[PDB]
Amino acid sequence: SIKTPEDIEKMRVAGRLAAEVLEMIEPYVKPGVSTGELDRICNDYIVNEQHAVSACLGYHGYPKSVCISINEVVCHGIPDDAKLLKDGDIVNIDVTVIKDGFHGDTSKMFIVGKPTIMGERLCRITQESLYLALRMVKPGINLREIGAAIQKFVEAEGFSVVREYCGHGIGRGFHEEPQVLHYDSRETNVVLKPGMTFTIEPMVNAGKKEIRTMKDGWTVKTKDRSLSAQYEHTIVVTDNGCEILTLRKDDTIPAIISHDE
Ligand SMILES: CCCC[C@H](N)P(=O)(O)O
Ligand SMILES: [Mn+2]
Ligand SMILES: [Mn+2]
Ligand code: NA
């Protein structure tokens, strides 16, 4: 759908809160901490301080407040008090908050302790694939072109793109039309228009693109157990570009990307 200025302002607030959770949890992602603990810290912050609520909790039965995925886990990892972080781990924390009826969805990678060279490389390329997509967003561009650009870049840098999970429209609903694929698909044909709000959240594997879903029905892993990274931002298409609603202080791209001269 097409969001109104009123809707957009509310999404700015929800997006900002979601981003602030990631900025807050940052210093706690250390060797020795459990993902279950990281989840409690995030949830307490969201409920007690932001006076908001996690959109993940209860969604199709999801048991926790945030998704935390480690190394070969592609996405939707479930926080667990028994799972401790250790040196070298690459960790994605995916946050989705609901405030004033609107959603804000974002995630970023964190490397624990001493980084591994390929670990740093994978995360770097993944974030750049997101940035590349974001600098492309403007009315007139087709989602298929965006997905094609992401895939071309990722593959050009020696990695693979996960096909089964994608970005999505977002607003008063967690997942709304359209689907935002991170690769070139014949199924995709959507011309962007101002007012559309959606996410871009490429999942990149160091090895092959194939994945597998665990018995819990949530945890997704790379079929070859290679590392997988992901970054996500929620945006709104503007008259001549886009505006990132979940920008953080550490992002190396501005909130508003305009294509004017
Ligand atoms: C708890 C369900 C997972 C929802 C994730 N934020 P996404 O749909 O962006 O992977
Ligand atoms: Mn997400
Ligand atoms: Mn999402
Ligand atoms: Na991973």
PDB file of all heavy atoms in Angstrom, residues 157-170:
ATOM      1  N   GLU A 157      31.522 -10.703  -5.513  1.00  0.00           N
ATOM      2  CA  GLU A 157      32.454 -10.669  -4.389  1.00  0.00           C
ATOM      3  C   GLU A 157      32.726 -12.054  -3.797  1.00  0.00           C
ATOM      4  O   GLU A 157      33.261 -12.170  -2.692  1.00  0.00           O
ATOM      5  CB  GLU A 157      31.945  -9.725  -3.299  1.00  0.00           C
ATOM      6  CG  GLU A 157      31.920  -8.248  -3.696  1.00  0.00           C
ATOM      7  CD  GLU A 157      33.294  -7.693  -4.051  1.00  0.00           C
ATOM      8  OE1 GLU A 157      34.298  -8.125  -3.445  1.00  0.00           O
ATOM      9  OE2 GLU A 157      33.369  -6.803  -4.926  1.00  0.00           O
ATOM     10  N   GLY A 158      32.341 -13.100  -4.528  1.00  0.00           N
ATOM     11  CA  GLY A 158      32.599 -14.460  -4.082  1.00  0.00           C
ATOM     12  C   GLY A 158      31.674 -15.127  -3.080  1.00  0.00           C
ATOM     13  O   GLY A 158      32.058 -16.129  -2.470  1.00  0.00           O
ATOM     14  N   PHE A 159      30.470 -14.593  -2.895  1.00  0.00           N
ATOM     15  CA  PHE A 159      29.519 -15.188  -1.959  1.00  0.00           C
ATOM     16  C   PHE A 159      28.213 -15.553  -2.663  1.00  0.00           C
ATOM     17  O   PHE A 159      28.068 -15.327  -3.868  1.00  0.00           O
ATOM     18  CB  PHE A 159      29.240 -14.229  -0.794  1.00  0.00           C
ATOM     19  CG  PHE A 159      30.459 -13.903   0.023  1.00  0.00           C
ATOM     20  CD1 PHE A 159      30.765 -12.585   0.349  1.00  0.00           C
ATOM     21  CD2 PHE A 159      31.301 -14.918   0.468  1.00  0.00           C
ATOM     22  CE1 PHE A 159      31.897 -12.284   1.108  1.00  0.00           C
ATOM     23  CE2 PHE A 159      32.432 -14.628   1.224  1.00  0.00           C
ATOM     24  CZ  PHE A 159      32.731 -13.309   1.544  1.00  0.00           C
ATOM     25  N   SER A 160      27.269 -16.116  -1.910  1.00  0.00           N
ATOM     26  CA  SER A 160      25.977 -16.517  -2.462  1.00  0.00           C
ATOM     27  C   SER A 160      24.809 -15.865  -1.724  1.00  0.00           C
ATOM     28  O   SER A 160      24.924 -15.493  -0.552  1.00  0.00           O
ATOM     29  CB  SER A 160      25.825 -18.041  -2.405  1.00  0.00           C
ATOM     30  OG  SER A 160      25.888 -18.514  -1.069  1.00  0.00           O
ATOM     31  N   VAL A 161      23.680 -15.743  -2.417  1.00  0.00           N
ATOM     32  CA  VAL A 161      22.483 -15.130  -1.850  1.00  0.00           C
ATOM     33  C   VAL A 161      21.402 -16.156  -1.510  1.00  0.00           C
ATOM     34  O   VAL A 161      21.052 -17.001  -2.340  1.00  0.00           O
ATOM     35  CB  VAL A 161      21.874 -14.108  -2.838  1.00  0.00           C
ATOM     36  CG1 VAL A 161      20.622 -13.473  -2.238  1.00  0.00           C
ATOM     37  CG2 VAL A 161      22.901 -13.047  -3.179  1.00  0.00           C
ATOM     38  N   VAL A 162      20.871 -16.067  -0.292  1.00  0.00           N
ATOM     39  CA  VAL A 162      19.807 -16.962   0.158  1.00  0.00           C
ATOM     40  C   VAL A 162      18.520 -16.575  -0.566  1.00  0.00           C
ATOM     41  O   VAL A 162      18.142 -15.402  -0.604  1.00  0.00           O
ATOM     42  CB  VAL A 162      19.604 -16.858   1.684  1.00  0.00           C
ATOM     43  CG1 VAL A 162      18.408 -17.701   2.122  1.00  0.00           C
ATOM     44  CG2 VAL A 162      20.863 -17.333   2.392  1.00  0.00           C
ATOM     45  N   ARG A 163      17.849 -17.574  -1.134  1.00  0.00           N
ATOM     46  CA  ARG A 163      16.628 -17.359  -1.907  1.00  0.00           C
ATOM     47  C   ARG A 163      15.305 -17.436  -1.143  1.00  0.00           C
ATOM     48  O   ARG A 163      14.368 -16.688  -1.443  1.00  0.00           O
ATOM     49  CB  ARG A 163      16.566 -18.384  -3.047  1.00  0.00           C
ATOM     50  CG  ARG A 163      17.817 -18.479  -3.931  1.00  0.00           C
ATOM     51  CD  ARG A 163      17.915 -17.306  -4.892  1.00  0.00           C
ATOM     52  NE  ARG A 163      18.748 -17.599  -6.060  1.00  0.00           N
ATOM     53  CZ  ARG A 163      20.076 -17.610  -6.062  1.00  0.00           C
ATOM     54  NH1 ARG A 163      20.750 -17.339  -4.953  1.00  0.00           N
ATOM     55  NH2 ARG A 163      20.735 -17.897  -7.179  1.00  0.00           N
ATOM     56  N   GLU A 164      15.235 -18.340  -0.168  1.00  0.00           N
ATOM     57  CA  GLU A 164      14.009 -18.586   0.589  1.00  0.00           C
ATOM     58  C   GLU A 164      13.444 -17.511   1.495  1.00  0.00           C
ATOM     59  O   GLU A 164      12.253 -17.532   1.803  1.00  0.00           O
ATOM     60  CB  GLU A 164      14.140 -19.879   1.393  1.00  0.00           C
ATOM     61  CG  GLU A 164      14.249 -21.115   0.532  1.00  0.00           C
ATOM     62  CD  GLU A 164      15.675 -21.427   0.134  1.00  0.00           C
ATOM     63  OE1 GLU A 164      16.549 -20.538   0.259  1.00  0.00           O
ATOM     64  OE2 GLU A 164      15.919 -22.564  -0.312  1.00  0.00           O
ATOM     65  N   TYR A 165      14.279 -16.589   1.944  1.00  0.00           N
ATOM     66  CA  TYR A 165      13.788 -15.521   2.793  1.00  0.00           C
ATOM     67  C   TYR A 165      14.078 -14.210   2.093  1.00  0.00           C
ATOM     68  O   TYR A 165      15.069 -14.086   1.372  1.00  0.00           O
ATOM     69  CB  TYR A 165      14.433 -15.594   4.174  1.00  0.00           C
ATOM     70  CG  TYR A 165      13.977 -16.816   4.936  1.00  0.00           C
ATOM     71  CD1 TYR A 165      14.479 -18.079   4.628  1.00  0.00           C
ATOM     72  CD2 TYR A 165      12.998 -16.720   5.922  1.00  0.00           C
ATOM     73  CE1 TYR A 165      14.015 -19.217   5.281  1.00  0.00           C
ATOM     74  CE2 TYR A 165      12.527 -17.851   6.579  1.00  0.00           C
ATOM     75  CZ  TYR A 165      13.039 -19.096   6.252  1.00  0.00           C
ATOM     76  OH  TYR A 165      12.566 -20.218   6.894  1.00  0.00           O
ATOM     77  N   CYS A 166      13.205 -13.235   2.297  1.00  0.00           N
ATOM     78  CA  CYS A 166      13.353 -11.960   1.619  1.00  0.00           C
ATOM     79  C   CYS A 166      12.840 -10.785   2.430  1.00  0.00           C
ATOM     80  O   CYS A 166      12.319 -10.950   3.536  1.00  0.00           O
ATOM     81  CB  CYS A 166      12.568 -12.018   0.312  1.00  0.00           C
ATOM     82  SG  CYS A 166      10.818 -12.392   0.603  1.00  0.00           S
ATOM     83  N   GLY A 167      12.993  -9.599   1.848  1.00  0.00           N
ATOM     84  CA  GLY A 167      12.515  -8.384   2.475  1.00  0.00           C
ATOM     85  C   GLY A 167      11.011  -8.364   2.303  1.00  0.00           C
ATOM     86  O   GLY A 167      10.444  -9.235   1.640  1.00  0.00           O
ATOM     87  N   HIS A 168      10.348  -7.366   2.866  1.00  0.00           N
ATOM     88  CA  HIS A 168       8.896  -7.340   2.769  1.00  0.00           C
ATOM     89  C   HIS A 168       8.299  -5.979   3.060  1.00  0.00           C
ATOM     90  O   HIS A 168       8.903  -5.159   3.749  1.00  0.00           O
ATOM     91  CB  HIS A 168       8.335  -8.341   3.775  1.00  0.00           C
ATOM     92  CG  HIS A 168       8.905  -8.171   5.151  1.00  0.00           C
ATOM     93  ND1 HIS A 168       8.407  -7.261   6.059  1.00  0.00           N
ATOM     94  CD2 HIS A 168       9.994  -8.725   5.736  1.00  0.00           C
ATOM     95  CE1 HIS A 168       9.164  -7.260   7.142  1.00  0.00           C
ATOM     96  NE2 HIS A 168      10.136  -8.138   6.971  1.00  0.00           N
ATOM     97  N   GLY A 169       7.100  -5.750   2.534  1.00  0.00           N
ATOM     98  CA  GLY A 169       6.415  -4.508   2.814  1.00  0.00           C
ATOM     99  C   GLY A 169       6.215  -4.536   4.317  1.00  0.00           C
ATOM    100  O   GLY A 169       6.287  -5.606   4.928  1.00  0.00           O
ATOM    101  N   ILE A 170       5.969  -3.378   4.914  1.00  0.00           N
ATOM    102  CA  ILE A 170       5.780  -3.295   6.353  1.00  0.00           C
ATOM    103  C   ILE A 170       5.009  -2.020   6.694  1.00  0.00           C
ATOM    104  O   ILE A 170       5.053  -1.038   5.952  1.00  0.00           O
ATOM    105  CB  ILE A 170       7.155  -3.303   7.062  1.00  0.00           C
ATOM    106  CG1 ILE A 170       6.982  -3.347   8.580  1.00  0.00           C
ATOM    107  CG2 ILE A 170       7.955  -2.081   6.644  1.00  0.00           C
ATOM    108  CD1 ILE A 170       8.293  -3.529   9.323  1.00  0.00           C
TER     109      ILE A 170
END
